[PDB]
Amino acid sequence: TQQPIVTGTSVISMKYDNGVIIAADNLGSYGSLLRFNGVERLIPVGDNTVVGISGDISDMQHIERLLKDLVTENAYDNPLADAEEALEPSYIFEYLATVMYQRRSKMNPLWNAIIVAGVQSNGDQFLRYVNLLGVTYSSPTLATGFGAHMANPLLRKVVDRESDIPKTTVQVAEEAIVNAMRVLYYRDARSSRNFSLAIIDKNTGLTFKKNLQVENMKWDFAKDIKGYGTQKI
Amino acid sequence: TTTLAFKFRHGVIVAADSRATAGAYIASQTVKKVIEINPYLLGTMAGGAADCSFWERLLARQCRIYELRNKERISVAAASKLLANMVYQYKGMGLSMGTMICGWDKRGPGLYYVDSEGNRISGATFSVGSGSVYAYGVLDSNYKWDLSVEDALYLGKRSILAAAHRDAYSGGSVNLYHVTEDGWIYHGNHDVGELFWKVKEEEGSFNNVIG
Amino acid sequence: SDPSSINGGIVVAMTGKDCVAIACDLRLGSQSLGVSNKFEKIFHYGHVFLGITGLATDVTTLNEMFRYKTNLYKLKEERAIEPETFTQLVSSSLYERRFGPYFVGPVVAGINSKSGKPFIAGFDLIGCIDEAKDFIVSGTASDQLFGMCESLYEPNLEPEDLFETISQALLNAADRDALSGWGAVVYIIKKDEVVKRYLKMRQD
Amino acid sequence: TTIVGVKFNNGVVIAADTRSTQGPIVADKNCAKLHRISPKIWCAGAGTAADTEAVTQLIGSNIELHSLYTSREPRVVSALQMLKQHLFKYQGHIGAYLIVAGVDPTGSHLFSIHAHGSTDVGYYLSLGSGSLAAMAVLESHWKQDLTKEEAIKLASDAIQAGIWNDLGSGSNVDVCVMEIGKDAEYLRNYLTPNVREEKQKSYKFPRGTTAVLKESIVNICDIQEE
Amino acid sequence: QFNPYGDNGGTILGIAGEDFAVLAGDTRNITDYSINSRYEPKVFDCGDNIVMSANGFAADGDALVKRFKNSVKWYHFDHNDKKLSINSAARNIQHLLYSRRFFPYYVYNIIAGLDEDGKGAVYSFDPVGSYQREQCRAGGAAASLIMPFLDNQVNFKNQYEPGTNGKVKKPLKYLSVEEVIKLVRDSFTSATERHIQVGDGLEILIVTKDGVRKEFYELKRD
Amino acid sequence: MDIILGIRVQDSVILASSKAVTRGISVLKDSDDKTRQLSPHTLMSFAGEAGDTVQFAEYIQANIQLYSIREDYELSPQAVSSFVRQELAKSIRSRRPYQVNVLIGGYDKKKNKPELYQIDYLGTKVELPYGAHGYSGFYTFSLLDHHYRPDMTTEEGLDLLKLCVQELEKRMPMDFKGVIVKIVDKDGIRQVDDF
Amino acid sequence: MDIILGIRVQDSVILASSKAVTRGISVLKDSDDKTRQLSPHTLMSFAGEAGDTVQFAEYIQANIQLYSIREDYELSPQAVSSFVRQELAKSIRSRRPYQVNVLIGGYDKKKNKPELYQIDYLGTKVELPYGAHGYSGFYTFSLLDHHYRPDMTTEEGLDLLKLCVQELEKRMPMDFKGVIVKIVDKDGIRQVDDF
Amino acid sequence: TSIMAVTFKDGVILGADSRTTTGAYIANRVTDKLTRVHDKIWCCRSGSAADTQAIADIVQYHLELYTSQYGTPSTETAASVFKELCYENKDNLTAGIIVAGYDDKNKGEVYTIPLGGSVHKLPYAIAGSGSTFIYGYCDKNFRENMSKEETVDFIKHSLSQAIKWDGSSGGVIRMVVLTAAGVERLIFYPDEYEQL
Amino acid sequence: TSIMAVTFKDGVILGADSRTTTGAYIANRVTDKLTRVHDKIWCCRSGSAADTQAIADIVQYHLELYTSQYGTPSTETAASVFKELCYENKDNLTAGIIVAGYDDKNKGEVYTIPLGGSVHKLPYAIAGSGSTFIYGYCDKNFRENMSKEETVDFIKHSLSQAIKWDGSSGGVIRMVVLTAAGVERLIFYPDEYEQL
Ligand SMILES: *[C@@](C)(CO)[C@](*)(O)[C@H](Cc1ccccc1)NC(=O)[C@H](Cc1ccc(OC)cc1)NC(=O)[C@@H](C)NC(=O)CN1CCOCC1
Numbered sequence A: 001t002q003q004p005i006v007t008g009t010s011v012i013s014m015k016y017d018n019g020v021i022i023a024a025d026n027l028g029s030y031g032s033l034l035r036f037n038g039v040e041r042l043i044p045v046g047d048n049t050v051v052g053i054s055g056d057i058s059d060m061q062h063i064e065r066l067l068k069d070l071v072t073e074n075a076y077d078n079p080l081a082d083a084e085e086a087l088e089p090s091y092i093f094e095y096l097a098t099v100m101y102q103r104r105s106k107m108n109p110l111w112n113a114i115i116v117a118g119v120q121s122n123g124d125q126f127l128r129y130v131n132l133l134g135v136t137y138s139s140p141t142l143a144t145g146f147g148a149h150m151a152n153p154l155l156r157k158v159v160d161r162e163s164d165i166p167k168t169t170v171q172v173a174e175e176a177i178v179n180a181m182r183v184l185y186y187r188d189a190r191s192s193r194n195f196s197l198a199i200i201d202k203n204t205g206l207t208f209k210k211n212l213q214v215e216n217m218k219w220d221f222a223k224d225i226k227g228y229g230t231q232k233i
Numbered sequence B: 001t002t003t004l005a006f007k008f009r010h011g012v013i014v015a016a017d018s019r020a021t022a023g024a025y026i027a028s029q030t031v032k033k034v035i036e037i038n039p040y041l042l043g044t045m046a047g048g049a050a051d052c053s054f055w056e057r058l059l060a061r062q063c064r065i066y067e068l069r070n071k072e073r074i075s076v077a078a079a080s081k082l083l084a085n086m087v088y089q090y091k092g093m094g095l096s097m098g099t100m101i102c103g104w105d106k107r108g109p110g111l112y113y114v115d116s117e118g119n120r121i122s123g124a125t126f127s128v129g130s131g132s133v134y135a136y137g138v139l140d141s142n143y144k145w146d147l148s149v150e151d152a153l154y155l156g157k158r159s160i161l162a163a164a165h166r167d168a169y170s171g172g173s174v175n176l177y178h179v180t181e182d183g184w185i186y187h188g189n190h191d192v193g194e195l196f197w198k199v200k201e202e203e204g205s206f207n208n209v210i211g
Numbered sequence C: 001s002d003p004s005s006i007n008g009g010i011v012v013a014m015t016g017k018d019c020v021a022i023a024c025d026l027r028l029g030s031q032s033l034g035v036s037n038k039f040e041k042i043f044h045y046g047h048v049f050l051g052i053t054g055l056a057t058d059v060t061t062l063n064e065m066f067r068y069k070t071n072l073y074k075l076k077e078e079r080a081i082e083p084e085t086f087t088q089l090v091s092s093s094l095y096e097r098r099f100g101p102y103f104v105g106p107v108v109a110g111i112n113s114k115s116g117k118p119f120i121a122g123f124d125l126i127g128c129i130d131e132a133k134d135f136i137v138s139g140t141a142s143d144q145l146f147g148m149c150e151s152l153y154e155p156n157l158e159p160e161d162l163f164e165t166i167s168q169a170l171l172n173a174a175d176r177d178a179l180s181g182w183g184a185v186v187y188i189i190k191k192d193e194v195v196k197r198y199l200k201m202r203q204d
Numbered sequence D: 001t002t003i004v005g006v007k008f009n010n011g012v013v014i015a016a017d018t019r020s021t022q023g024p025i026v027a028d029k030n031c032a033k034l035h036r037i038s039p040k041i042w043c044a045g046a047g048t049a050a051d052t053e054a055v056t057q058l059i060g061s062n063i064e065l066h067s068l069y070t071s072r073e074p075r076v077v078s079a080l081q082m083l084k085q086h087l088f089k090y091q092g093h094i095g096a097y098l099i100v101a102g103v104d105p106t107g108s109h110l111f112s113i114h115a116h117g118s119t120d121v122g123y124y125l126s127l128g129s130g131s132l133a134a135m136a137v138l139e140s141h142w143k144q145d146l147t148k149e150e151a152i153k154l155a156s157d158a159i160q161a162g163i164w165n166d167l168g169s170g171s172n173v174d175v176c177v178m179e180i181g182k183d184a185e186y187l188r189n190y191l192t193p194n195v196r197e198e199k200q201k202s203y204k205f206p207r208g209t210t211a212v213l214k215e216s217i218v219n220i221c222d223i224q225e226e
Numbered sequence E: 001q002f003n004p005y006g007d008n009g010g011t012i013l014g015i016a017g018e019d020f021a022v023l024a025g026d027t028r029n030i031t032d033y034s035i036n037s038r039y040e041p042k043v044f045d046c047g048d049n050i051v052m053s054a055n056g057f058a059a060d061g062d063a064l065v066k067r068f069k070n071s072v073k074w075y076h077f078d079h080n081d082k083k084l085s086i087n088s089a090a091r092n093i094q095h096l097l098y099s100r101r102f103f104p105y106y107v108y109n110i111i112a113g114l115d116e117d118g119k120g121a122v123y124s125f126d127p128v129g130s131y132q133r134e135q136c137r138a139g140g141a142a143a144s145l146i147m148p149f150l151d152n153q154v155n156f157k158n159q160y161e162p163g164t165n166g167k168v169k170k171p172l173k174y175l176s177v178e179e180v181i182k183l184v185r186d187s188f189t190s191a192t193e194r195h196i197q198v199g200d201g202l203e204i205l206i207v208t209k210d211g212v213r214k215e216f217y218e219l220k221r222d
Numbered sequence F, G: 001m002d003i004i005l006g007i008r009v010q011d012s013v014i015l016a017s018s019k020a021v022t023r024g025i026s027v028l029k030d031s032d033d034k035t036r037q038l039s040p041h042t043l044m045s046f047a048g049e050a051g052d053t054v055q056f057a058e059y060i061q062a063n064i065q066l067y068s069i070r071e072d073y074e075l076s077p078q079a080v081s082s083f084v085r086q087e088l089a090k091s092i093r094s095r096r097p098y099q100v101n102v103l104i105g106g107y108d109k110k111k112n113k114p115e116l117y118q119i120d121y122l123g124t125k126v127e128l129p130y131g132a133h134g135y136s137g138f139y140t141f142s143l144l145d146h147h148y149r150p151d152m153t154t155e156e157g158l159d160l161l162k163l164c165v166q167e168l169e170k171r172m173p174m175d176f177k178g179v180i181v182k183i184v185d186k187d188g189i190r191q192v193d194d195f
Numbered sequence H, I: 001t002s003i004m005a006v007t008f009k010d011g012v013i014l015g016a017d018s019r020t021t022t023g024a025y026i027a028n029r030v031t032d033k034l035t036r037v038h039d040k041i042w043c044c045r046s047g048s049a050a051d052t053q054a055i056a057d058i059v060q061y062h063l064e065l066y067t068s069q070y071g072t073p074s075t076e077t078a079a080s081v082f083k084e085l086c087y088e089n090k091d092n093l094t095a096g097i098i099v100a101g102y103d104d105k106n107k108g109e110v111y112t113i114p115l116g117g118s119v120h121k122l123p124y125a126i127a128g129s130g131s132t133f134i135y136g137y138c139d140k141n142f143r144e145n146m147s148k149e150e151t152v153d154f155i156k157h158s159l160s161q162a163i164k165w166d167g168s169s170g171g172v173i174r175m176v177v178l179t180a181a182g183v184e185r186l187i188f189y190p191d192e193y194e195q196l
């Protein structure tokens, strides 16, 4: 049993017709102090998977090393390591899910919420969540922390059920994700303007975008707001 | 729960209700609180359903090995003692069991009370469970050694009914057993809903209730 | 310890076609112990019916209090109080004890003598009104009653059909609750006749 | 609950869902969360249901008496001030979280108020368990210089976000529109996107199914003459 | 302090027929007041004509099912591909549950299938292994809403034959699969109305001698 | 205090109350009368926390005796029981509630009927054919449920009471030092000196 | 369990132990023998928490019986009492201590003297002419301090024991259902069937 | 919260962020923490919003009544009324207030009133959760008798850093200038101050 | 405690105060918080003195053994050993360590290891109770590729303010310069830095 120290906030994601999108800001908070401003919380595994992690950063870095070691271990005595016997999103997730549940069962959890986003061998979209309790679930949209409360409602307006996935393009899906990140910047006190975004498409492969910023923000209306009730000046 | 058992000239009667509870909610009303250890041995269940069931079935396996090794059926005293020592390992750990090991052996009819607290008591009359306090009144006032099997079965049935009526956590149906030297005999499942009205009319009791 | 579940009990009310029905169990307990099988939880002030669940001392107290207030209402207004008006009086009276409340779950049932419109309402222990069209539930088996009423109920039932529906809702909910039962009563209410029926149920 | 308030060109609009809960259980499926303080001043309430009703009736009663005393139409800032001072005095023990809105001779107004007595001003606001789902919609679609029709849509879209994505919110959408120089229009059940489907079976019983012990006529009439 | 348990809501329902059995459960997964998934399967085909659902804390439910499926696999290896009977599976599950008596699987578990005589069978478990066979059983969040309805409409409780006035009960006539599925759908539709953790979807698994069939029905998403 | 019983028969009410008073590990007295005569045909037995019991009983006694003098008329057992209940329901929300449970046994001379009322410290009133407070009813109710008839004689009620007491003396861990028994009928209140 | 007494007279040791076993508000048995014969001339009575009592007594019994067989020789009461004390002093610092208080009464055939040892759950041993465990001694020690002589006969010891029990039955709130009395002398151990 | 008040040659300037939080959720991102108690006496509020609003409302009442009887009150008088409330009700309040005002006689004055109810007259003052991160910066960069433009830049840069490091602070930077000329409201948006 | 490490053109400089407290009592006013784990790899310690000393001693052992087998370790390797201890024993430690070192290949590097056991490579780092008061100042005044003299002034001014506001910080300012030229120890007394 511990308490999280340096933490990462929301990770948001969704499925679209040919793949998945996942995003997360670049902040490492130390309580209310916005301590570290250059933290990458999306970690690619091969060219077909991106693991997005929120929660304790020290545990994130530990998980990052497990995944790096997993790739190394899979290549051992494996001539098809870059082909048929390459790591799949489902393999990577189940491994993490095994670790997370085992750790909670020893009362020494990895204080994280994880979303594994990727595309399988057969082109199927993979998107599943796991957390410190070992609780797992899948949905067309997935989000951690504040994203669950604010991003999911917005993303579910685009993909409300399974049948909406083929009707959703990558441009629409990316637009929804970027808008959600702006909303989280307005309303989450432990978020930053800078973020990373990853697209895993079954045709165009893995596109990893760094140093993105929230833009087109509405603040002008603030000038007209005066006082807290009766004040006019 | 309400469970009871008593020795008498013609063996030992064993009776129990069938209600299972999860707070105020009635989870089940058809549970077997009597356990079939072996054809000459019975066990009651009161308190933790899972605990009672698991340890008594474990006991039953222990008793069977005994028969294989020793070419002889285990005594009621030895059986109750195996249980007692088994649960005593886990004393203070949270186990909740109130049981009665009823049977007939070389010493005649035998009846032992065993609980998770560590007690192991031989006795002619027992009742354990939330409704035990109601059942004891009927038993103590009507219990004799020279009791006919017919009258004895009714006493154990009537005693459960008394408790099922008053205790909110006891009810459902009554399960009856009679243990002879030739083994135990099941004497049926009796719905309290129907049984209550029957007893009221035939006996005249429960006058305060309207029917 | 929980005052709302020491004595136990349930109340349910339903609307029908030009009629209402209100029913209750008869149990009064001290936790596991059953004390009385004649503790009726339904009272009436003229043609307005009030069922109260919860702590029995507060049930008894509130009855005596609403009898007090409705008798004065009648002397001054020169007419019997109506369900809509009584409902507001119950709410007012409960909220005036906001920080030392009566541990009760009242249920109003009746027919407006002028409009002829059937009326039911429920409250939380501090006065929040739940004016439902279909049914109202209260007591230790409220979850059970919600399940029964929500599946068995259909609108515009005739008195003799409504009787069977509400009775079965009560009986089967009570039989899945340790703290409810020991008898049951059902009131069938029409604009100018009221029938009261005692049900036969299991006494455990 | 989910409740919202949205300002527009010539007035203000508020909206709410219609679910009330007792833990995980739904007590009322068509609850009324839009309360009237005065004819053109309405408030939506979240938190302890009795408190939001009681505190609204009380201030509305005192507002009416004040309006009669002053021979003037009541102002929203009066209701706001009276509410926050009352709530502050009870140190949050009256669990009323309200969005207060209305029109008066001064213009159109929109405020939020918390149980401890803090007030806020805004062009768009949201309160309740579904406030985050609603605010996500408002932050995505709100703009300056909205029309009446755009504002009603934004408000109900915000409430829907709560209905679908928040378990504490559900059923229907209520709306009240307060436009300058007009009567306020209270739109009860403006939307009804959660009608129960037809049941597979009828559970109407045969008459005589239930066992009965006694029957008796209940005397509800007064004592008779002669 | 770290709480190793959670509540993912959901509700499940098992009904046993004369020559069939059903195991139903909603597809909603939740934490507190949020929805995780509107479609997350909760009832599984475990092999040997046995269906299973562990409702409550999803992480413990997934682990138990995963272990039982594994227990079935090794039962075949060790006993010459012998079919695991429903009564044998139930006893095995008791031991899976009680092996964690002092750190329980926080789930209410139900299995359904056919007994060795071909009749429908439903077994219900508590979190620590107490099990019993039943004809009708609802487990989970809205179990208290549904079970009284099933007592009334499956076992005909408190129902008597008109004219006799409480002297003669309603006879226990068996139900068909089509009649059962109606009670299941009405049970979940009623539960969805009054319980906030129930909704989104309903997935039913029907077991016959022919195999395991599925049926899916939408529920209210509020 | 510990055990107080009550049984209403055909023409009377019988109240049985334990004799023991205990402070910790010591029995201070073994002949304590846990009852007060409220009026010539109304008797109240009581049990609860020390001090509260007697203070409450005597407070009630004084109020009923005052009423009797003022009106030159004996209140009905029902009227007395309602007065007592209101005092307890008033007490439970006070700064320090009376921790007292009571049984009121009386003979209504107007209706020519015996009446027994059970009232707990919360102000929970119930009219009964037989009743008990505390852990007493747990042992005795099964016997009363079995043997009780409303047409019982006073002598039959006493025999049933002996049976109830015998069961208490067997299964209760606490020694309550027997009971004082009192009968309330048309001719007033008297004590059974041999029990 | 509740009351265990012990008195050493001229030529014997008398142990009196209560008969009642209680689980909460219910007396489970009223004829329980709270003693084990450790050897032909050594008797141990015991009282404490349920389970611990019997488990400990029978564990001690087995060890002494093992010694007797191995050496074909009966240990002295002093040797047995020291063995028991060490087991309890070992127990008190263990993960879960035995919650048991004991009295060891024995006749030393070598010295031709009766001996009584009082040992509590901590391993506190003391040789006494008379002793008690729990709340028993509180009532009885004043009578024993007054009436006790070391030259008393067995019959005089029993009469003094009756007096001690009579005082317990008067002033103890708990009903312990009388006592089983056992005498340990040169001829072995026997039970007084009428007390 | 991040608030400050700074005296300069021509008068005094109040400054504040616009973020109000309920835990990690931002309940309001365009809050006005600069509140008026008299024509040219304003305050910056920190701590409980309910407490600071109730206090400022009472003070505004006291100063309105003071003015009706005795004429325009001093900034010291205003700070005394705040103090009297904050000090006597310290067990039931959580309020950190900065009082700032302009006289023609006394010119620009700044009083800070931390949690206990003590009063401290200063050349400039900083308060709120975000003030901790700019004690070093403000001490190094503050000068007396700055110009209006210099003082605006000082507050802008200071609050910019406070917002950067404190998650409880953010939104826009509001400012209020108090001089003989009158009362001027200023506002600065993220795109302006973040790139400093 | 107030500690910092700053990279510059020629290498890296570590800086720290010299105050150790037991509550409000100053147990030591001339503490050396700059500790050597290898010839040109040093660390700044914050948190529990017992924990940080035990850790640094173990690390020094690991790096001495590393050097005997594999030659001179990297600053990243040193930071990894610190991390491995701080992370795996996080439940029983209270250590906030800044690692700083000089290679000829990698030049000056700075790693910070806060309470959880996470690692963060930075251009400069600040830590300790007194660091809170200089987040604003350090962010505004830090530049990359500063000269030795510029970097010394930056640390001196920064720690000067941290000491000024933090009671847990104080005493002298110690510094350690790590370049290709070698290792230079510096010290600055109150009379020098207080008047800045
Ligand atoms: C009476 C009913 C309660 O006093 C009696 O002791 C029964 C005995 C009993 C014996 C065998 C099987 C079932 C019941 N006990 C219970 O009903 C217990 C009471 C209890 C509740 C909570 C506890 O935790 C501290 C301990 C005891 N109930 C249970 O054990 C309950 C948790 N389990 C079940 O009801 C098991 N059923 C529920 C439906 O699924 C099948 C298994």
Ligand SMILES: *[C@@](C)(CO)[C@](*)(O)[C@H](Cc1ccccc1)NC(=O)[C@H](Cc1ccc(OC)cc1)NC(=O)[C@@H](C)NC(=O)CN1CCOCC1
Pocket (backbone or CB within 6 Å): C124, C125, C126, C128, D001, D002, D019, D020, D021, D022, D023, D027, D031, D032, D033, D045, D046, D047, D048, D049, D050, D052, D053, D095, D128, D129, D168, D169
């Ligand atoms: C959503 C549903 C929040 O869940 C919303 O805020 C509604 C608002 C509302 C407003 C007007 C009418 C109806 C509903 N709130 C509720 O539905 C509340 C939820 C709630 C329960 C308990 C609370 O105290 C901690 C606070 C809020 N429901 C109720 O208030 C109602 C059902 N009463 C009660 O549950 C009884 N309270 C009374 C006071 O003590 C606790 C239980």
Ligand SMILES: [Mg+2]
Pocket (backbone or CB within 6 Å): B081, B082, B083, B085, B086
């Ligand atoms: Mg054993």
Ligand SMILES: [Mg+2]
Pocket (backbone or CB within 6 Å): B163, B164, B165, B166, B167, B168, B169, B170, B171, C203, C204
């Ligand atoms: Mg019962």
Ligand SMILES: [Mg+2]
Pocket (backbone or CB within 6 Å): D162, D163, D164, D165, D166, D167, D168, D169, D170, E221, E222
């Ligand atoms: Mg919803």
Ligand SMILES: [Mg+2]
Pocket (backbone or CB within 6 Å): G118, G119, G120, G124, G125, G126
């Ligand atoms: Mg001793």
Ligand SMILES: [Mg+2]
Pocket (backbone or CB within 6 Å): H163, H164, H165, H166, H167, H168, H169, H170
């Ligand atoms: Mg910020």
Ligand SMILES: [Mg+2]
Pocket (backbone or CB within 6 Å): I163, I164, I165, I166, I167, I168, I169, I170, I171
């Ligand atoms: Mg200092």
